[PDB]
Amino acid sequence: MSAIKPDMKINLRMEGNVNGHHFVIDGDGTGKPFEGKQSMDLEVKEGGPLPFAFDILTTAFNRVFAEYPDHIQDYFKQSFPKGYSWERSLTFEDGGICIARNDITMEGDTFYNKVRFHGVNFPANGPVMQKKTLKWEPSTEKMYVRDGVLTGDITAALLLEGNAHYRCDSRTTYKAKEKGVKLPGYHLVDHCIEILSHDKDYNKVKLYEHAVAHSGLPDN
Amino acid sequence: HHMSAIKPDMKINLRMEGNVNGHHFVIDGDGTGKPFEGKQSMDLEVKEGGPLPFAFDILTTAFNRVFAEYPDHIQDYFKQSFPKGYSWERSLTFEDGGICIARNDITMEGDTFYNKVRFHGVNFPANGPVMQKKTLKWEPSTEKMYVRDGVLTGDITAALLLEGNAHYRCDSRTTYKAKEKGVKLPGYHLVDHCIEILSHDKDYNKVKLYEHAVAHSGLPDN
Amino acid sequence: MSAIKPDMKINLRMEGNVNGHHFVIDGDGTGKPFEGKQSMDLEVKEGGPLPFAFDILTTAFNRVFAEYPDHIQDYFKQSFPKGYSWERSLTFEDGGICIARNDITMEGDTFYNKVRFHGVNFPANGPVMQKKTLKWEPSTEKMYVRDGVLTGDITAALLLEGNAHYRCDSRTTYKAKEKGVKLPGYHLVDHCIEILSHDKDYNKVKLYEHAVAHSGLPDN
Amino acid sequence: SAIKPDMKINLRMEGNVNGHHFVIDGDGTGKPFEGKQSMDLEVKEGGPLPFAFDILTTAFNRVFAEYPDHIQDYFKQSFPKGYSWERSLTFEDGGICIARNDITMEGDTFYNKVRFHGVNFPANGPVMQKKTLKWEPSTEKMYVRDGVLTGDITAALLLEGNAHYRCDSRTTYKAKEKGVKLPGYHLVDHCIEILSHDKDYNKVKLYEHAVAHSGLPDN
Ligand SMILES: O=S([O-])[O-]
Ligand SMILES: O=S([O-])[O-]
Ligand SMILES: O=S([O-])[O-]
Numbered sequence: 001m002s003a004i005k006p007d008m009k010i011n012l013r014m015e016g017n018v019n020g021h022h023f024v025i026d027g028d029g030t031g032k033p034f035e036g037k038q039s040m041d042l043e044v045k046e047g048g049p050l051p052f053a054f055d056i057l058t059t060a061f062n063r064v065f066a067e068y069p070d071h072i073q074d075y076f077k078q079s080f081p082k083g084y085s086w087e088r089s090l091t092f093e094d095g096g097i098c099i100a101r102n103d104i105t106m107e108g109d110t111f112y113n114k115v116r117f118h119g120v121n122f123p124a125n126g127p128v129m130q131k132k133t134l135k136w137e138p139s140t141e142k143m144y145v146r147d148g149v150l151t152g153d154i155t156a157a158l159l160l161e162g163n164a165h166y167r168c169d170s171r172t173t174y175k176a177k178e179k180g181v182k183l184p185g186y187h188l189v190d191h192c193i194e195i196l197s198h199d200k201d202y203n204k205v206k207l208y209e210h211a212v213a214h215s216g217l218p219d220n
Numbered sequence: 221h222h223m224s225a226i227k228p229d230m231k232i233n234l235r236m237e238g239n240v241n242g243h244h245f246v247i248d249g250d251g252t253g254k255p256f257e258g259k260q261s262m263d264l265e266v267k268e269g270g271p272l273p274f275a276f277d278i279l280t281t282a283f284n285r286v287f288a289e290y291p292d293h294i295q296d297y298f299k300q301s302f303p304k305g306y307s308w309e310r311s312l313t314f315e316d317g318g319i320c321i322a323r324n325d326i327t328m329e330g331d332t333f334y335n336k337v338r339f340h341g342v343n344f345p346a347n348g349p350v351m352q353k354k355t356l357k358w359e360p361s362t363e364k365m366y367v368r369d370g371v372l373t374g375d376i377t378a379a380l381l382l383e384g385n386a387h388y389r390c391d392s393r394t395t396y397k398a399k400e401k402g403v404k405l406p407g408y409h410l411v412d413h414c415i416e417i418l419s420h421d422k423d424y425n426k427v428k429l430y431e432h433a434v435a436h437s438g439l440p441d442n
Numbered sequence: 443m444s445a446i447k448p449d450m451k452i453n454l455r456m457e458g459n460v461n462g463h464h465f466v467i468d469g470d471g472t473g474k475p476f477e478g479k480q481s482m483d484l485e486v487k488e489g490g491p492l493p494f495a496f497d498i499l500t501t502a503f504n505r506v507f508a509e510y511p512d513h514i515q516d517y518f519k520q521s522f523p524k525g526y527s528w529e530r531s532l533t534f535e536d537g538g539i540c541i542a543r544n545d546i547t548m549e550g551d552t553f554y555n556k557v558r559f560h561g562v563n564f565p566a567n568g569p570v571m572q573k574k575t576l577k578w579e580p581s582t583e584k585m586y587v588r589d590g591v592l593t594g595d596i597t598a599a600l601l602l603e604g605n606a607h608y609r610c611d612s613r614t615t616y617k618a619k620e621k622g623v624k625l626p627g628y629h630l631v632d633h634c635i636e637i638l639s640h641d642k643d644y645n646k647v648k649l650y651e652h653a654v655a656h657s658g659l660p661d662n
Numbered sequence: 663s664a665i666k667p668d669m670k671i672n673l674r675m676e677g678n679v680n681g682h683h684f685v686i687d688g689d690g691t692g693k694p695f696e697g698k699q700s701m702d703l704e705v706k707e708g709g710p711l712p713f714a715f716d717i718l719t720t721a722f723n724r725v726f727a728e729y730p731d732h733i734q735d736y737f738k739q740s741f742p743k744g745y746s747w748e749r750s751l752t753f754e755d756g757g758i759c760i761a762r763n764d765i766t767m768e769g770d771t772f773y774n775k776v777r778f779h780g781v782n783f784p785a786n787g788p789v790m791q792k793k794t795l796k797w798e799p800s801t802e803k804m805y806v807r808d809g810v811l812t813g814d815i816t817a818a819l820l821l822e823g824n825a826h827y828r829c830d831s832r833t834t835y836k837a838k839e840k841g842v843k844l845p846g847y848h849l850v851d852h853c854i855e856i857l858s859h860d861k862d863y864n865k866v867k868l869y870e871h872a873v874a875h876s877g878l879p880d881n
């Protein structure tokens with residue numbers, strides 16, 4: 001019966017505009033929803049080479065891939081087969097601001113992802129337009145309900161070249177397609193995201209994420 | 221520096237496309253204005269996505285700082301950006317987490333400004349004034365203009381008046397970029413705005429918009 | 443009914459702590475409430491020389507000194523003789539954060555100001571700790587009521603060396619001592635504050651402010 | 663060396679919130695290497711407090727955090743001479759607090775000189791109306807910025823009626839002694855609890871458990 005299979009495929013299509021530069025990126029990947037692990041091969045179809053740091057895009061490339069323990073409601077696995085969508089804001093400390101959307105549907109063993117990404121006001125001398133980012137640091141997303149909608153806030157950080165950090169405040173709203181999907185209580189989701197490999201211009205990127213839901217101390 | 225080919229009476233042509241809270245929309249604008257008086261009007265028509273499920277007011281500042289009265293002692297970046305034109309990018313951070321970005325690519329052919337506008341909004345709560353259409357108007361605002369990381373930047377602390385005498389705060393940051401080289405950057409200055417929906421139909425599928433803008437140096441000389 | 447005189451004396455006592463550094467500063471001044479003008483001689487009694495930019499303190503050194511038109515309700519002049527108090531948050535773009543308070547009273551022809559100022563998290567190499575500020579730019583405070591309390595918001599900026607700018611978001615809450623003082627509608631107050639003179643270490647400072655309330659365009 | 667498995671905690675807080683002055687004393691014990699501590703708090707001046715006691719609780723020492731061997735422990739290495747911190751708390755409704763603690767150590771006791779100031783809390787907000795229940799368990803993101811160890815938290819207060827009240831916190835940590843090695847980026851999980859209190863929160867028992875870690879997949 002279950003909509004969620006142990007091994008699932010990921011189909012993704014992103015179109016976006018950062019600082020006036022339009023781009024199209026396709027992703028094709030696989031994942032283990034119950035283990036909270038997924039990997040995806042990304043290919044820039046339009047707008048390559050990207051004039052900005054690829055890292056700002058990577059969290060937009062599905063919380064269904066997160067290990068949820070029995071005592072926390074899994075809103076995301078409960079949202080299928082119909083699916084769910086999310087909206088996100090990324091507020092960077094130097095004034096750069098991004099919003100993103102993803103409409104997530106499923107057919108058989110495959111998730112389909114319609115993603116949009118727009119970023120503005122990144123300074124020319126900043127780490128994003130200078131491509132000085134190395135990776136996102138491991139984060140902890142704070143999950144809670146606000147105005148009937150499941151919300152996730154993260155104090156995120158990009159590691160820069162020269163071992164400095166670049167801060168980003170992330171807010172995501174998650175909405176199931178189907179009515180009656182039970183909202184979860186407050187909890188946390190640990191994230192770890194990594195670009196495993198890329199070509200020189202990041203026209204081709206292999207991406208990996210691991211995520212685990214928990215209740216924080218002392219339950220750990 | 222050079223003659224802008226900006227005439228005292230200009231036409232305005234505008235297509236906006238956007239998505240707020242998952243809802244796609246296309247809106248056209250046709251207007252007229254007096255750049256040196258800092259005044260403009262425009263009739264807006266929702267072409268796709270009507271009727272909008274959100275407050276039309278959030279879009280109205282996206283619907284050109286050429287239409288601003290600049291005194292002789294403050295550099296006018298925008299009129300000097302023409303004939304070639306300029307583009308802007310904006311972030312709108314509302315107090316309840318709603319966040320919008322917007323851009324506009326502005327060009328000029330003869331007597332007409334052309335505006336390619338894009339508007340994207342996320343995270344507006346369902347029972348907030350935006351999704352509930354509980355806004356009345358923008359209050360008159362004052363944009364702070366300064367050069368930030370080598371780019372002219374406008375920061376506004378704005379307020380939407382709500383039904384029930386309450387206000388709804390929005391912080392906006394706009395970055396302005398001339399297309400042609402050699403455009404002198406201005407020093408710090410202020411721009412007073414007053415934007416107003418003069419009339420609309422019930423669903424805001426048709427809207428008449430008006431703006432009055434005046435640049436000044438603040439106290440004591442203003 | 444007012445007892446606010448066209449010419450008023452100003453007595454001020456500030457104590458505070460920025461970056462762990464405690465200080466006491468006294469002010470002696472005069473002003474013209476109905477012209478919206480005031481000046482003040484400031485003297486650092488303890489904590490001198492200040493290791494931070496004096497400019498961050500200057501807005502803490504009374505909206506009584508603002509020219510209000512008849513068509514705008516003057517909360518501040520109406521708050522006397524009993525007086526009023528304000529609290530303020532100053533949020534700087536590099537994470538430095540200040541709070542301040544002033545309890546304002548009137549005895550005869552003199553205003554007494556009990557001021558407190560605390561600032562934290564200023565970067566060692568930012569313009570505040572490095573004293574790279576030149577002046578506050580003239581500003582426009584947005585006045586409006588929030589939760590039954592008069593509130594003013596400012597998109598403020600410090601001019602720096604080289605004519606760069608350092609942004610500060612200022613929120614003040616204004617509370618009359620007497621109950622029932624009628625709240626004003628939305629309006630603006632233009633400000634221009636200046637250090638007219640000072641000694642090398644800013645132990646002695648002559649300060650000036652001009653403020654004028656208005657309705658914004660098209661009226662002003 | 664400097665820090666014992668069992669330690670005493672002596673604390674004085676003096677502060678002002680919404681114009682209301684207060685003095686709170688604290689006495690407690692903790693196990694630094696287990697990252698646990700308890701404290702009996704007494705409001706000496708300003709009782710009963712007209713605001714939610716919860717907003718003060720994180721002001722009442724990252725010495726009390728379990729640091730694993732693979733992460734530099736700036737705090738335990740800061741002793742015997744000690745360290746200070748400054749903090750901003752930015753609440754979602756405009757309320758803003760700053761706080762400071764100078765932490766010293768003589769013998770088996772920590773000494774804490776705490777100051778706390780809060781402004782712009784709305785009269786019908788959860789803080790002034792005392793509608794908070796607790797802080798939710800949190801994760802502090804630790805990193806260096808401009809030569810100084812810095813911790814950011816997206817924290818939440820649980821309210822009556824099951825809603826939440828968001829607070830963004832930034833703490834700057836500074837060793838008294840020079841040359842203390844800065845750690846690399848890491849995380850600190852927190853759980854803070856009022857164990858017991860009287861009706862007016864004049865007396866409060868407070869508990870914190872905290873554990874440093876490297877995040878997924880190494881935690
Ligand atoms: O083994 S995970 O780093 O791709
Ligand atoms: O296990 S402690 O949170 O009562
Ligand atoms: O700025 S002063 O000279 O009025």
Ligand SMILES: O=S([O-])[O-]
Binds near residue numbers: 414416432659660
């Ligand atoms: O002319 S006024 O109504 O904006």
